[PDB]
Amino acid sequence: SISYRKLDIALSADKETVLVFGQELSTKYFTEIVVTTMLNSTGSDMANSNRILNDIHAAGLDAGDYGKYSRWWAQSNAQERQEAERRRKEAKAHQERMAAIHAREEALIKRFG
Amino acid sequence: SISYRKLDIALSADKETVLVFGQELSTKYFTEIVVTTMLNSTGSDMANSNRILNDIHAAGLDAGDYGKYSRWWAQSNAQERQEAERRRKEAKAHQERMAAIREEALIKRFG
Amino acid sequence: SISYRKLDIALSADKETVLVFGQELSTKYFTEIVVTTMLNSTGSDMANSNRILNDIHAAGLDAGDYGKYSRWWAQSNAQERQEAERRRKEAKAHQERMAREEALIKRFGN
Ligand SMILES: [Mg+2]
């Protein structure tokens, strides 16, 4: 499969959305639809799926939620996984410093009941 | 392929958007790009593609628009398809009760 | 793989977003995530990936950024590539004719 560039993913302070390459998406749409489809489209290209999941982990998302791709990633290159873990800890620290600061529905209700 | 969770899809009253796992998308973008890519990414994993298409059907969308995947799905387990049909009829009733009750700034951006 | 319909893609005047089947997306999200995933999902079905990349090219986007799919496409049917090129030039002429973004900071800090 062809690889993705390093995934530009930021998780929102309330965790409800992500910012992916300048596009804001609901977190659950990204993790349940987008990432699953990216991984499935890699087929058996474990190097590519490992890259994707390292970026998922680095962004603070759950890289273990993707079946065989997750099991491959979890028993994959320890040093690249560790670089992802360093990035993840930096992300969590950013979330902590962001947690140091002090009507969508109605709209959706009118459109979807 | 790895499976999707049960697809959380709601069709808007005017049918122009869908709400998928909390994300609003144009219906045409979802059905022409997103669903097509999900199904293609299953390869020949018919259990997964039948799951996807049962959720598409249950949401009130057209599960017949996806070539070989739709042909497989149409011949698939009748009871699982019927459970999807029950959900589809409930969604249609919800649309009926809702039918009982801009800006197109796109021009400036896209011409 | 199953085919896509002709891709309805318009590039914004500032090039920062695209309008794809009525959905506005950041251009980089569309080209880095969506298109890459569509192409990967075709596997080795070059007829389908060539159709995708002709529509990408026709919209004013870079059809050369997708590895093997781009390499296959660049040597594919010259007349179909040229029809895409005509659409691309018409799109560029369209771009030529003329007359609190964060906001994300409060949400993402960056
Ligand atoms: Mg998408």
Q: Is residue C8 part of a domain?
A: yes
Q: Is residue C104 part of a domain?
A: no
Asked if B41 reaches chain C (Cβ–Cβ under 8 Å), the answer is yes
Asked if C109 reaches chain A (Cβ–Cβ under 8 Å), the answer is yes
Q: Pick from C78, C68, C94: which is nearest to C15 by CA? A: C94
Provide the pairing of β-strand A23-26 with A9-11: unpaired
Count residue pairs from B and C with Cβ separation < 8 A: 62
**d(CA A25, ligand 1 centre) in Å:** 9
Asked if C104 reaches chain A (Cβ–Cβ under 8 Å), the answer is yes
Q: Is residue C79 part of a domain?
A: yes
- Residue that the structure tokens 């899809």 belong to: B9
Which residues span the domain enclosing C33? Answer: 1-99
Distant-in-sequence, close-in-space partners of B27: CB < 8 Å, separation ≥ 6: B11, B12, B15, B16, B17, B18, B61, C22
Cα-to-chain-centroid distance, residue C86: 15
Q: Is residue C24 part of a domain?
A: yes
Cα distances (angstroms) measured from residue B30 to each of A15, A51, B33, C47, C65:
23, 26, 6, 23, 24
Task: Give strand pairing partners of B31.
Answer: none
Resolution in A: 1.7
Q: Is residue C37 part of a domain?
A: yes
- Residue that the structure tokens 């690249």 belong to: A80
CB contact under 8 A, B12 and A66: no
Give the phi and the psi of residue A94 in degrees, each rounded to 5. -60, -40
Neighbours of chain A (3+ CB pairs under 8 A): B, C
Q: Is residue B27 part of a domain?
A: yes
CB contact under 8 A, C21 and B39: no
Strands, sheet with C23-26, edge to edge from the N-terminal-most edge strand? C9-11, C17-20, C23-26
B12 vs C45: CA distance, rounded Å:
34
Q: Is residue B110 part of a domain?
A: no
A 43-102 residues with CB < 8 A to C = 43, 94, 97-98
Q: Pick from C21, C23, C18, C14: which is nearest to C59 by CA? A: C18
Q: Are C4 and C51 in contact (CB under 8 A)?
A: yes
Q: Is residue C108 part of a domain?
A: no
Per CB-CB distance under 8 Å, the chain A contacts of B40 are 41
Q: Pick from C52, C93, C82: which is nearest to C69 by CA? A: C52
Provide the pairing of β-strand C23-26 with C17-20: antiparallel
Q: Structural domain tally of chain A? A: 1
Method: X-ray
Q: Closest Cα of chain C to A103: distance in Å?
A: 17
The burial of B77, by beta-carbon neighbours within 10 Å (0-12 exposed, 13-18 middle, 19 or more buried), is given as exposed
Task: Give strand pairing partners of C9.
Answer: C20
Per CB-CB distance under 8 Å, the chain A contacts of C29 are 20-23
Task: Give strand pairing partners of A23.
Answer: A20
CB contact under 8 A, A16 and B24: no
Task: Give strand pairing partners of A17.
Answer: A26
CB contact under 8 A, A66 and B22: no
DSSP-derived letter for residue C11 is E
**d(CA C78, ligand 1 centre) in Å:** 31
